[PDB]
Amino acid sequence: VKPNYALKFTLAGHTKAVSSVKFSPNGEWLASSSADKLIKIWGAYDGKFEKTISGHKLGISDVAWSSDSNLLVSASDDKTLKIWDVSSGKCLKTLKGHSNYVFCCNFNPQSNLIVSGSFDESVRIWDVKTGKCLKTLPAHSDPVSAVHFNRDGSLIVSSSYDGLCRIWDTASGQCLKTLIDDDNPPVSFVKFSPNGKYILAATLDNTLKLWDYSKGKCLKTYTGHKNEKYCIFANFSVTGGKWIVSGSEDNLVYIWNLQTKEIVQKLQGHTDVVISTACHPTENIIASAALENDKTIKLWKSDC
Numbered sequence: 001v002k003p004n005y006a007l008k009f010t011l012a013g014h015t016k017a018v019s020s021v022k023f024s025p026n027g028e029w030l031a032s033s034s035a036d037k038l039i040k041i042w043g044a045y046d047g048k049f050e051k052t053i054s055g056h057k058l059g060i061s062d063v064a065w066s067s068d069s070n071l072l073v074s075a076s077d078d079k080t081l082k083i084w085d086v087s088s089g090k091c092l093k094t095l096k097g098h099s100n101y102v103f104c105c106n107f108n109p110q111s112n113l114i115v116s117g118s119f120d121e122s123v124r125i126w127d128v129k130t131g132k133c134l135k136t137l138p139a140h141s142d143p144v145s146a147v148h149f150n151r152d153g154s155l156i157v158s159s160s161y162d163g164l165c166r167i168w169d170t171a172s173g174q175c176l177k178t179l180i181d182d183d184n185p186p187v188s189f190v191k192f193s194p195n196g197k198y199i200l201a202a203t204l205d206n207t208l209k210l211w212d213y214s215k216g217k218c219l220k221t222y223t224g225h226k227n228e229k230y231c232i233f234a235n236f237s238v239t240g241g242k243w244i245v246s247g248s249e250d251n252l253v254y255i256w257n258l259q260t261k262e263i264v265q266k267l268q269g270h271t272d273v274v275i276s277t278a279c280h281p282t283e284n285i286i287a288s289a290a291l292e293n294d295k296t297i298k299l300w301k302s303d304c
């Protein structure tokens with residue numbers, strides 16, 4: 001069984017590269033961040049432009065939703081994160097502490113903590129309510145490409161240009177595991193599987209790997225895409241068939257069968273690097289976004 005993703009909507013509005021797209025947990029909205037210093041909100045089903053949220057002094061690299069779909073956090077080249085009330089557009093908190101660009105951010109499932117990674121080679125854990133930094137982790141020896149909480153918030157995975165994936169105890173700040181393969185190319189993206197048992201890791205050798213972090217063993221390898229330069233988001237698609245979804249420097253969205261590792265679809269339409277993909281929480285919908293020669297977001301829908 002293969003999916004049949006077809007283009008439904010193209011979303012234009014950002015005036016510089018799009019950096020990240022994310023669906024709201026409630027499935028109603030897509031958030032986009034851009035080098036143009038803006039967050040835009042769009043209807044997840046109709047692609048209808050909703051609103052712009054502004055206030056960052058420099059480009060935004062990443063955005064993430066709270067579990068109640070009410071807050072966004074953004075990571076900016078201005079060295080801050082901002083917590084936003086989506087309905088009002090209010091900046092609730094400015095999270096200050098990183099000494100260089102803030103590159104990646106996420107809420108924990110409980111949505112009482114934010115994790116951030118920075119070009120300062122640190123990971124920070126923040127209190128959502130106070131905006132206070134709780135822990136600085138000396139995580140890496142080069143820029144941090146990704147940070148992600150597991151399904152119960154007990155672990156953080158981080159990745160770096162240093163070629164390491166690291167698993168952290170949220171409560172203690174202790175480094176529990178460092179994942180090392182037969183070589184250590186730059187790790188451009190990492191995230192936990194929905195069940196928290198696996199980690200999907202992208203490396204700048206045109207390769208995605210599914211790791212059993214408990215066993216510290218590689219289970220699956222996915223190739224055929226182009227990834228030598230950029231930190232491209234990848235996803236587990238779970239609403240229909242069990243897929244891996246990623247962007248590509250050849251301007252395509254790649255979809256693999258998770259178990260068999262075969263490419264099942266390549267989605268054509270973007271005119272620059274596909275830097276970001278996101279999977280809708282309930283419908284077979286993918287959002288993709290491209291860099292500065294394109295600047296569009298596309299919504300794709302499958303029957304399976």
Ligand SMILES: CCC[C@H](NC(=O)c1cccc(Cn2ccnc2)c1)C(=O)N1CCc2sccc2C1
Pocket residue numbers: 017018019020061062103104143144145146160161162186187188204229230231232233275
């Ligand atoms: C090639 C120029 C520099 C490179 N720009 C990006 O990867 C980039 C640019 C825009 C948007 C996004 C999307 N993204 C993903 C997560 N947070 C935002 C990423 C960059 O920052 N590296 C080079 C490659 C690697 S591998 C590990 C760190 C880095 C840093």
